[PDB]
Design a protein around this ligand. Structure first.
Ligand SMILES: Nc1ncnc2c1ncn2[C@@H]1O[C@H](COP(=O)(O)OP(=O)(O)OP(=O)(O)O)[C@@H](O)[C@H]1O
Ligand SMILES: Nc1ncnc2c1ncn2[C@@H]1O[C@H](COP(=O)(O)OP(=O)(O)OP(=O)(O)O)[C@@H](O)[C@H]1O
Ligand SMILES: Nc1ncnc2c1ncn2[C@@H]1O[C@H](COP(=O)(O)OP(=O)(O)OP(=O)(O)O)[C@@H](O)[C@H]1O
Ligand SMILES: Nc1ncnc2c1ncn2[C@@H]1O[C@H](COP(=O)(O)OP(=O)(O)OP(=O)(O)O)[C@@H](O)[C@H]1O
Ligand SMILES: [Mg+2]
Ligand SMILES: [Mg+2]
Ligand SMILES: [Mg+2]
Ligand SMILES: [Mg+2]
Lengths: 254, 405, 239, 213, 140, 390, 258
């Protein structure tokens, strides 16, 4: 074994009774984080999404275009977009689009969601975030989905007896990981929220969340599209008018 | 109405708006990065200093020192001599973290100098004693003590006359002139809590005490008393007070004791009862079912309202002293102290500056003097003037009162 | 914690809620006031209005009496209340003594009213500042300024509102006897002062002029445009 | 067999324990709470067992457990709870005929485990109240006995002025009066020195406030 | 009105698995344990293959999300968010069904109440006269 | 006094444009690197008692905590499993250098002191050092002239011209707090300090000094400042310090008390009883009002630097800086975006530039234009009643 | 916390309770008004149109303040009733004093001064009702004003308060002719904006009330349009929309051919 491959904080195997280093093992990863990367991609596809043409184009810009063709951005002289925040009413397809991205991308897809980074022990959510982003950097290019970020990350409260200072610390660590020293190399983040007005201005700041995609409820044309999408596998009788059903459904989500 | 870039779009945008040097620049930058990686790889790794002495100080044949005197004696504490049964002693040992054992001596040329709890040395295979050892010293508590006196005297503490007098009484007069106290039949207070707004001369007075006193002074690191291994903090405070008692006249200086223990209400703090337990042991040591000896305690804290009433009780903290914001005379004195060393004009009105800085602390005034010097520097001037000091006051104290004319 | 009560001193000695009334004044549009030899002038920023909105109901310059005008900066409803009470007191002082109200008297009354509302605890301070410009019965171009705290001063030129500090500094730098030597350079000076804060300069400017014995005259928008053209010409010439 | 002495900090229950150990003969075991939470698993239970065994061997014995709230509050938690259970078992494991009495002490009983205060276990509760006016006058005379206090001091007035001082605070009042008399070169303590003592004990200062006649 | 009893009936005539929990059991003291138990329950169902989770009284946690301003309300909203996540999210479950019982569905969060992959709503009214006849006959 | 660690960084090629001069500069860097690589190769290609001493030294040497050195050849050491042994000291050890608590080295089997290992820095604090140097020079910070001046006077002048202060007996500020709204240059002005400093830079985030166990957060803070003081001059940059340092209220939980204990350890390190070396601290904060006064105290934090939203000239500077490397068209006048009196951070302006570039690329044009910039401004910015005033 | 009382200033100078009332006005039923050189008019939506409700009163939101003035209320019902009675009292007090109808601006100023006093004094919550006044006076002819909970009022050519007021006012801004709008065009625009702002299926005539003020023979007449007239206007608007959709379909067919 060559020393140069033996970097700090790496696992190595030692012979018995001699403690001789004889192999470099996979880098240690917290089991909660390790079982957090996606191994089997969802089966959702961009063809299962209807009425989200512009949202798909913008999200695809932010994620696909930089990783695939950083030369374009270098020629433009601009910095690559880094983060995208999906928001909108309930059920408009915010997680459907994330599943479609995970299925259609060839980048390492990591997924946090809900309060997976909220731990009763002190200073554990921050550590889990650090380990997450270390894992993403290792398996770059990476796309980190974060569903329901308002759970882990929302308007900060004054430090007192009635404030979640620890969840605030977790969010601060996440902010530092998104944009602090040593900017991320190829990690792109897709946060998803159902109410955006409460997220911390630090999270919503550009550079951390470069783009913000709204998901309005379908406008009867997206509703016709969704009806077709979800009735394709169905024995529809003749004379059945999905346009009439779409009209009958005003302000209804996907 | 927004086309998506096709194969031709990307194959032309990378090839149409293009400098004839772009490819070479990119390749050269990549080569530089790779070369940097390779250079770091080859010369990487220094020689971590392992502690080897310069040659010619070593002594080979120490392989014989490793084969003879080989016994890597473990240390054990003889907790019971089994009554010695007259003959056939059959000592008992308490090898910590390992086990208890019933053992005997071996070549112990002084089978009488064994005692109980004498920290004997014991072999590995057969646990016979070989050599006793002096009592444990707990290096953490050993270095907690202050050895080099800080260079702060009772002349850089301006604006604190009554507080300095009280602290001097309680901490020094019982040590250097017991005759007056014994004559008047008064036992002087044993324990002082210095409290005030953040930055008023609390730790500065502690430093002045450390400089003046000729007696043991123990600065207690508030973080060193909190550990894992429940009971460790209580053990450390116990050993600390034991060493203080060993010393003829001791002065402990718990700083920022708000760290070690506030109110004892647990409720959801079931995981923070260890700190409360070490605080309770500190309380017991300060005053309990035992004389405390010539141990005097100092306790500094900004917030003496989170503290436990059992700890604030005036049997443990007997001479609570408040470091209030200095009055005008104190502020003028602080300006004089801090500007003594500065290169300033000879007609600056420090009384005027003290007036301009109300409700300001000594640290605030130090900052004002530093910023005055900084303003002088930011103008290539060697002498800081009254104007610079006024600018510093404006910048530090504050950062319109037309209704208060 | 020493706040939310109008009658509670803070340990530093501050009554914080009247200071908050001043901070509410600071959220109003710039209003400049200048005094000359025979002219007293008030300029104000308009902030423009939605094209569907009417303009005559948006007043910042209100004539309290024949020889007194008041420019406003603060809460609009408080503006209306204080202006109405000031008008009532002008015409009631006329009854009490057969003499027109002096600028000092009327500004003193307005300040006393604001102080009366700051005194108690069941009242909210009048979160407004006012510029009172007028001519005494003898004839003298007086200009006063009243704050929400009930304190009134006499100024030679001052600005209140969003651009208060910048406009006041500019007036300090560029207010002089030669600049107010006649009855037109004062107006030039007021438009110059306002142009430092109002971006447009012609659609965000209203000037009101008071000359001795003459009723308040509000300059036409075309006249404002001509004046700003004159300032622009002088600026380019002297560049 | 079990008496608990509970009260606010400073009322004098530890001093009562010391006085009992003085004028009680017998063998006195001064257990002190946090001493019994050693890190090694089972060491605390071993300590409790050894202490009770020593008390049993020395037949007439009193085990004074200062600040019982340390040994177990209400619920590392496993080990401290096991030590508390060992203490419970040791208490329950002998009839009152045994001459091994136990005197627990506590500032805050609301912390203490209710199971500890049960019939058979520590049962005779002794509330230690804040000293009344006469008690405060007593405490002051007691702690000023060995001084040069002038006969003109009015301990009744001092007790009136205290207003919810502990006995520890009354002692501190006496000590601070002594120090204040040592200042200003005084051969005797005086009532005004005592007043300044109460002031310093409360940490307050006396100033001639300008709006007072 | 026999909704917990219908849950027990499906548990009895269940072929795969039935995990029973009470919504009030998710409000434990230490930070981030209600969500941890929601995740554990759903992971247990997935590992145990086709399963039926039952949550007896969900009103405690799954109420209109509201704007939290303290750690306790925020933690309850966190529990609800974790429940929404696990019931329909990036990790679509296979053969893991859910039943939630409540006294009123009007205070329920619109997201959890989402007439989509999160709930189908049924009412258990007070017994009619005919249903009362049936209840008496069965009980007797 | 190990000395500054610094951060190796290559020269900077002045012409950002793609032209032959840049090629020559880069080629010169590359050719020097190639000569260095070949020199190392030739050194190793042209290249007893200590070997046998190391052979006598244990093969799998263990690390144990020395405790109460005795005699001149026998000391008590710890096995890092709680056990402790009365071991011997070979002549190889330095002696006069062992101190209690020092992580000495022990022979694996016979357990004899054979080394001292005076580099037992925890990995958590070794990772938080700066070995690279971000390429954000002060020329990438549009405006913020006063803030740059303050931080230079605090962490640069005391190292580059340490005569001005000694010439008037003044100690330069040891602590700066950069506070402001979310995104104004607070972290750029630490990146630039790291880039342009010769001192050991130590990145940290307040949410990182908090540790799971009891007494570990304070221990980590003590270790961090110990290493920062061994390496001097050093700068410690605590980003988002309101993670730890928020107001110190009367806690009821245990984790909160431990967090406050970590904060007090930090306070003692910043300005405690004993002393402080040439370690200078830079904290960063979005909301300073919630920080504890003892931390914001002007003995621990001598300077407080506000980073307000940029004014018009600063905004023009930001657009110039962030469109420099962009092939701006001649149809674009970067004044319409400036004039609009809306909250625009430098981060917002950079996002505007990036989105304008993306709009151009979407329109299939590699040169941005004014309509592209307008669209980007409208679509990037995400976030009092009418007539209530005036 | 700076919103526990109406008479408390925020440290920034904002009356949070007054702002709360202003925002709360958004719960009220959408009312709007258009000014035409031929006349002025209000329209308003019936939030609650349950079939079991009776129609005892000819108008729920539109009140007649005096001969030459009407007003639509939007906000709390009790406050609206109080203020309508007070407006009538103010107008009739002016008429008693001067023997001529109160000018519309004067009436608006009086009621808004009452509202300001409520915002300023003691323990009295501000009136949570916005008002739209239409009137005719000898000085400025047909006038339309709007008044807030804070006692601030403005004069408008066209405006909207209540629900979806932002959308309605934007639509009026788009499709209002600053000086060439007659009463017929005003009614058509009102129907259009109400249809596009109510966001409840088709524009049910029973869910809208319209009133028009016009001068006739030298006397002002305020008419609340009958349900027949409202239905006719809605039907004409629906026919116009259908014609526009037919034109768009024909354009789509032509594009398909191309
Ligand atoms: N635009 C759409 N096209 C097709 N199907 C859709 C669309 N939007 C929603 N759906 C359907 O609705 C399901 C739920 O959508 P999704 O999980 O993405 O919603 P969400 O925004 O995450 O909701 P929640 O408020 O529950 O967090 C999707 O799995 C898909 O079945
Ligand atoms: N009375 C004083 N006289 C002279 N210098 C003073 C005085 N008070 C403060 N200072 C200056 O302030 C600093 C001393 O602060 P110190 O360590 O005493 O604060 P502290 O009150 O213990 O604060 P904290 O515990 O909140 O950190 C030194 O710069 C000292 O010069
Ligand atoms: N009633 C009293 N009579 C006389 N002295 C008293 C009395 N109460 C308290 N003291 C004095 O208080 C000082 C400390 O008392 P002691 O240590 O007994 O307090 P405690 O309240 O029993 O202890 P703890 O702090 O554990 O609650 C001693 O000087 C004691 O003389
Ligand atoms: N004055 C400035 N000059 C140049 N770029 C700036 C400036 N201010 C902000 N930026 C840009 O902002 C982005 C990062 O900002 P920065 O990291 O300094 O923000 P911050 O104040 O640390 O924010 P936060 O509180 O969110 O951590 C980079 O694009 C940087 O170019
Ligand atoms: Mg979702
Ligand atoms: Mg200190
Ligand atoms: Mg039930
Ligand atoms: Mg930052």
């Amino acid at each position: 074994i060559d020393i140069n491959d033996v970097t700090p904080n790496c696992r190595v195997a030692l012979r018995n009774d001699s403690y001789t280093l004889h192999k470099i093992l996979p880098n240690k990863v917290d089991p909660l984080v390790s079982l957090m990367m996606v191994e089997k991609v969802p089966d959702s596809t961009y063809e299962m999404i209807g009425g989200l043409d512009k949202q798909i184009k913008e999200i695809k810009e932010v994620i696909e275009l930089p990783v695939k063709h950083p030369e374009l951005f270098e020629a433009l002289g601009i910095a690559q977009p880094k983060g995208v925040l999906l928001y909108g009413p309930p059920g408009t397809g915010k997680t459907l689009l994330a599943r479609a991205v995970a299925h259609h991308t060839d980048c390492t897809f990591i997924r946090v969601s809900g309060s997976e980074l909220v731990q009763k022990f002190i200073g554990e959510g921050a550590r889990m975030v650090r380990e997450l982003f270390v894992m993403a950097r290792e398996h770059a290019p990476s796309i980190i989905f974060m569903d329901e970020i308002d759970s882990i990350g929302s308007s900060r409260l004054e430090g007192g007896s009635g404030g979640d200072s620890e969840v605030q610390r977790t969010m601060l660590e996440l902010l530092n990981q998104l944009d602090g020293f040593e900017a991320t190399k190829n990690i792109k983040v897709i946060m998803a929220t159902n109410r955006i007005d409460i997220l911390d201005s630090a999270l919503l700041r550009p550079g951390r969340i470069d783009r913000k995609i709204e998901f309005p409820p379908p406008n009867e044309e997206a509703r016709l599209d969704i009806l077709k999408i979800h009735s394709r596998k169905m024995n529809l009788t003749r004379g059945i008018n999905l346009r009439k059903i779409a009209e009958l459904m005003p302000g209804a989500s996907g | 109405p927004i086309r998506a870039l096709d194969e031709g779009d990307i194959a032309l945008l990378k090839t149409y708006g293009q400098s004839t040097y772009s490819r070479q620049i990119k390749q050269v930058e990549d080569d530089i990065q790779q070369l940097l990686k390779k250079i770091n790889e080859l010369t990487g790794i220094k020689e971590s200093d392992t502690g080897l002495a310069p040659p010619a100080l070593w002594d080979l044949a120490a392989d014989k020192q490793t084969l003879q005197s080989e016994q890597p004696l473990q240390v054990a504490r003889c907790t019971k001599i089994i009554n010695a049964d007259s003959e056939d002693p059959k000592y008992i040992i308490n090898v910590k973290q390992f086990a208890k054992f019933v053992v005997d001596l071996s070549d112990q040329v002084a089978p009488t100098d064994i005692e109980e709890g004498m920290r004997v040395g014991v072999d590995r295979n057969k646990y016979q004693i070989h050599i006793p050892l002096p009592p444990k010293i707990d290096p953490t508590v050993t270095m907690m003590q202050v050895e080099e006196k800080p260079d702060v005297t009772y002349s850089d503490v301006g604006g604190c006359k009554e507080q300095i007098e009280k602290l001097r009484e309680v901490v020094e007069t019982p040590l250097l002139h017991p005759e007056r106290f014994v004559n008047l039949g008064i036992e002087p207070p044993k324990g002082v809590l210095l409290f005030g707004p953040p930055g008023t001369g609390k730790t500065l007075c502690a430093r002045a005490v450390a400089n003046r006193t000729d007696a043991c002074f123990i600065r207690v690191i508030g973080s060193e008393l909190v550990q894992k291994y429940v009971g460790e903090g209580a053990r450390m405070v116990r050993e600390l007070f034991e060493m203080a008692r060993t010393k003829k006249a001791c002065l402990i200086f718990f700083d920022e004791i708000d760290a070690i223990g506030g109110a004892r209400f647990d409720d959801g703090a079931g995981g923070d009862n260890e700190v409360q337990r070490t605080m309770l042991e500190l309380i017991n040591q300060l005053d309990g079912f035992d004389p405390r000896g010539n141990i005097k305690v100092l306790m500094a804290t900004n917030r003496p309202d989170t503290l436990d009433p059992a700890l604030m009780r005036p049997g443990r903290l007997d001479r609570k002293i408040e470091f209030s914001l200095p009055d005008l005379e104190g502020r003028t004195h602080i300006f004089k102290i801090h500007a003594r060393s500065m290169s300033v004009e000879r007609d600056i009105r420090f009384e005027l500056l003290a007036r301009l800085c109300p409700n300001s602390t000594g640290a605030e005034i130090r900052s004002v003097c530093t910023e005055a010097g900084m303003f002088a520097i930011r103008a290539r001037r060697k002498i800081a003037t009254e104007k610079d000091f006024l600018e510093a006051v404006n910048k530090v104290i504050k950062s319109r009162y037309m209704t208060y004319n | 914690s020493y706040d939310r009560a109008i009658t509670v001193f803070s340990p530093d000695g501050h009554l914080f809620q009247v200071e908050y009334a001043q901070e509410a004044v600071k959220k109003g549009s710039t209003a400049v006031g200048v005094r000359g030899r025979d002219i007293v002038v008030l300029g104000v920023e308009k902030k423009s209005v939605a094209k569907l909105q009417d303009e005559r109901t948006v007043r910042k310059i209100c004539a309290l009496d024949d020889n007194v005008c008041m420019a406003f900066a603060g809460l609009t409803a408080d503006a209306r209340i204080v202006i109405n009470r000031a008008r009532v007191e002008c015409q009631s002082h006329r009854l009490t003594v057969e003499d027109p109200v002096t600028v000092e008297y009327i500004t003193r009354y307005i300040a006393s009213l604001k102080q009366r509302y700051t005194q108690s605890n069941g009242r909210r301070p009048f979160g407004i500042s006012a510029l009172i410009v007028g001519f005494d019965f003898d004839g003298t171009p007086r200009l006063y300024q009243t704050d929400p705290s009930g304190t009134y001063h006499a100024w030679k030129a001052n600005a209140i509102g969003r651009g208060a500090k910048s406009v006041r500094e500019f007036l300090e730098k560029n207010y002089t006897d030669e600049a107010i030597e006649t009855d037109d350079l004062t107006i030039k000076l007021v438009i110059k002062a306002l142009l430092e804060v109002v971006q447009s300069g012609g659609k965000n400017i209203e000037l009101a002029v008071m000359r001795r014995d003459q009723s308040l005259k509000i300059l036409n928008p075309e006249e404002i445009e001509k004046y700003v053209a004159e300032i622009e010409k002088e600026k380019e010439e002297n560049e | 067999k079990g008496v608990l002495m509970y009260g606010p900090p400073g009322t004098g229950k530890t001093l009562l324990a010391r006085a009992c150990a003085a004028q009680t003969k017998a063998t006195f075991l001064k257990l002190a709470g946090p001493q019994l939470v050693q890190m090694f698993i089972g060491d605390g239970a071993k300590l409790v067992r050894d202490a009770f065994a020593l008390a049993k061997e020395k037949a007439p014995s009193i085990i004074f457990i200062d600040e019982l709230d340390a040994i177990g509050t209400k619920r590392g938690d496993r080990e401290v709870q096991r030590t508390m259970l060992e203490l419970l078992n040791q208490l329950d494991g002998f009839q009152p005929n045994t001459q091994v009495k136990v005197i627990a002490a506590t500032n805050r009983v609301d912390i203490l485990d209710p199971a500890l205060l049960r019939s058979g276990r520590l049962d005779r509760k002794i509330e230690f109240p804040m000293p009344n006016e006469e008690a405060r006058a007593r405490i002051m005379q007691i702690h000023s006995r060995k001084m040069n206090v002038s006969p003109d001091v009015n301990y009744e007035e001092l007790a009136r002025c205290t207003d919810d001082f502990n006995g520890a605070q009354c002692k501190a009042v006496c000590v601070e009066a002594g120090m204040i008399a040592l200042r200003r070169g005084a051969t005797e303590l005086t009532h005004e020195d005592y007043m300044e003592g109460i002031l310093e004990v409360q940490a307050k200062k006396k100033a001639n406030l300008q709006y007072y006649a | 009105c026999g909704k917990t009893m219908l849950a027990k009936a499906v548990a009895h005539h269940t072929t795969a698995a039935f995990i029973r929990v009470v919504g009030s059991e998710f409000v434990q003291k230490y930070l981030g344990e209600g969500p941890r138990m929601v995740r554990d329950v759903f992971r247990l169902a997935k590992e145990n293959a086709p399963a039926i989770i039952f949550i007896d009284e969900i009103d405690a946690i799954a109420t209109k999300r509201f704007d939290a301003q303290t750690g306790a309300d925020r933690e309850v909203q966190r529990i609800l968010l974790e429940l929404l996540n696990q019931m329909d999210g990036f990790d679509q479950n296979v053969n893991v069904k859910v039943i939630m019982a409540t006294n009123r569905a009007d205070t329920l969060d619109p997201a959890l109440l989402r007439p989509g992959r999160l709930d189908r709503k049924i009412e258990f009214p007070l017994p009619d006269r005919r249903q009362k006849r049936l209840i008496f006959s069965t009980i007797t | 006094t190990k000395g500054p660690d610094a951060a190796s960084k290559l020269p900077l090629v002045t012409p950002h444009t793609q032209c032959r001069l840049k090629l020559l500069k880069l080629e010169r860097i590359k050719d020097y690197l190639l000569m260095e690589e070949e020199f190392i190769r030739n050194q190793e290609q042209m290249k007893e008692e200590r070997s046998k001493v190391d052979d006598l030294r244990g093969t799998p040497m263990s690390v144990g905590t020395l405790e109460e050195i005795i005699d001149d050849n026998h000391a008590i050491v710890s096995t890092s499993v709680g056990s402790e042994h009365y071991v011997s000291i070979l002549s190889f050890v330095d002696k006069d250098l062992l101190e209690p608590g020092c992580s000495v080295l022990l022979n694996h089997k016979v357990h004899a002191v054979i080394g001292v290992l005076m580099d037992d820095t925890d990995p958590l604090v070794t990772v938080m050092k700066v070995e690279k140097a971000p390429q954000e020079t002060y020329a990438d910070i549009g405006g913020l002239d006063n803030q740059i001046q303050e931080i230079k006077e605090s962490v640069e002048l005391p190292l580059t011209h340490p005569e001005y202060y000694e010439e008037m007996g003044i100690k330069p500020p040891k602590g700066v707090i950069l506070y402001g709204p979310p995104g104004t240059g607070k972290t750029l002005l630490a990146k630039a300090v790291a880039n342009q400093t010769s001192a050991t830079f130590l990145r940290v985030v307040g949410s990182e000094l908090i540790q799971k166990y009891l007494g570990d957060g304070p221990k980590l803070v003590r270790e961090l400042f110990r290493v920062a003081e061994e390496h001097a001059p050093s700068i410690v940059f605590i980003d988002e310090i309101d993670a730890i340092g928020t107001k110190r209220y009367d806690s009821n939980s245990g984790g909160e008390r431990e967090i406050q204990r970590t904060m007090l350890e930090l306070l003692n390190q910043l300005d405690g009883f004993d002393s402080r070396g040439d370690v200078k601290v830079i904290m960063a904060t979005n909301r300073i009002e919630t920080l504890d006064p003892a931390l914001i105290r002007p003995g621990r934090i001598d300077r407080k630097i506000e980073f307000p939203l940029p004014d018009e000239k600063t905004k023009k500077r930001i657009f110039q800086i962030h469109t420099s490397r962009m092939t701006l068209a001649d149809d674009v006048t970067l004044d319409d975006l400036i004039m609009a009196k809306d909250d625009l951070s430098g981060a917002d302006i950079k996002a505007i530039c990036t989105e304008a570039g993306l709009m151009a690329l979407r329109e299939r044009r590699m040169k941005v234009t004014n309509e592209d910039f307008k669209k980007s401004k409208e679509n990037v910015l995400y976030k009092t009643p009418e007539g209530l005033y005036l | 916390r700076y919103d526990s009382r109406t008479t408390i200033f925020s440290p920034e100078g904002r009356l949070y309770q007054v702002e709360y009332a202003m925002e709360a006005i958004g719960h009220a039923g959408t009312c709007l008004g258009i000014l035409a050189n031929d006349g002025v008019l209000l329209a308003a939506e019936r939030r609650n149109i349950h079939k079991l409700l009776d129609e005892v009163f000819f108008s729920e939101k539109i009140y007649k303040l005096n001969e030459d003035m009407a007003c639509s209320v939007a906000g709390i019902t009790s406050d609206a009733n109080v203020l309508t009675n007070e407006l009538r009292l103010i107008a009739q007090r002016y008429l008693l004093q001067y023997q001529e109808p109160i000018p519309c601006e004067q009436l608006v100023t009086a009621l808004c001064d009452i509202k300001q006093a409520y915002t300023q004094f003691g323990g009295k919550r501000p009136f949570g009702v916005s008002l739209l006044y239409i009137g005719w006076d000898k000085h400025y002819g047909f006038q339309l004003y709007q008044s807030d909970p804070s006692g601030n009022y403005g004069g408008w050519k066209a405006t909207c308060i209540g629900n979806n007021s932002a959308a309605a006012v934007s639509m009026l801004k788009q499709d209002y002719k600053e000086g060439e709008m007659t009463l017929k065009s005003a009614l058509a625009l009102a129907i259009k904006v109400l249809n596009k702002t109510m966001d409840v299926s088709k524009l049910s005539a029973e869910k809208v009330e319209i009133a028009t003020l016009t001068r006739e023979n030298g006397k002002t007449v305020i008419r609340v349009l009958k349900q027949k007239e409202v239905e006719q206007l809605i039907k004409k608007h629906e026919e116009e929309e259908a014609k526009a959709e037919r034109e768009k379909k024909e354009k789509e067919q032509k594009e398909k051919d191309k």
